[PDB]
Amino acid sequence: VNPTVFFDIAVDGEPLGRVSFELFADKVPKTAENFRALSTGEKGFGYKGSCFHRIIPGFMCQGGDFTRHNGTGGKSIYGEKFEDENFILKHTGPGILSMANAGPNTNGSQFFICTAKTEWLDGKHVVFGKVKEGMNIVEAMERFGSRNGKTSKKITIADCGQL
């Protein structure tokens, strides 16, 4: 079946709670595997200790830049970038997990958790999972965002792995 991965979220080092994601390996196996492996760290690098650098309430939470912590870095398990696998799945509402990118076929490690329906991203960003448990924790994280995306406290992935 599809893998489930968890993030344990901290706010300025204090524990907030746990989010778990279902990864749609049955429909986007290469994209799901990248996120899974970065969550376990099994390749020697990944998300543990990294931050959510951009949070816009009513839009999305963005993270995954574990090399420069500000949206300019990250890398995939396949190299610096990899292709758009397919666009079968759509941005249907809160909880959707989708890849950030900088143009066609530029996926790395950055991702965003949607907190609203974002249909204008359909066909441009690859959807590859959804929040399974802990959407309330995503809602709590949202409250530390701002209109321009800067967070008022440091939101980090204190631990992560596969359930």
Author numbering: 2 to 164
Text of the article:
Here, we describe XFEL serial crystallography experiments and MicroED experiments using batch-grown microcrystals of the enzyme cyclophilin A (CypA). CypA is a proline isomerase enzyme that is highly abundant in human cells, and plays important biological roles as both a protein folding chaperone and modulator of intracellular signaling pathways. Conformational heterogeneity of a key network of residues in CypA that extends from the core of the protein to the active site has been studied previously using ambient-temperature crystallographic experiments. Rotameric exchange of residues in this network, which includes R55 (the catalytic residue), M61, S99, and F113, is required for enzymatic turnover.
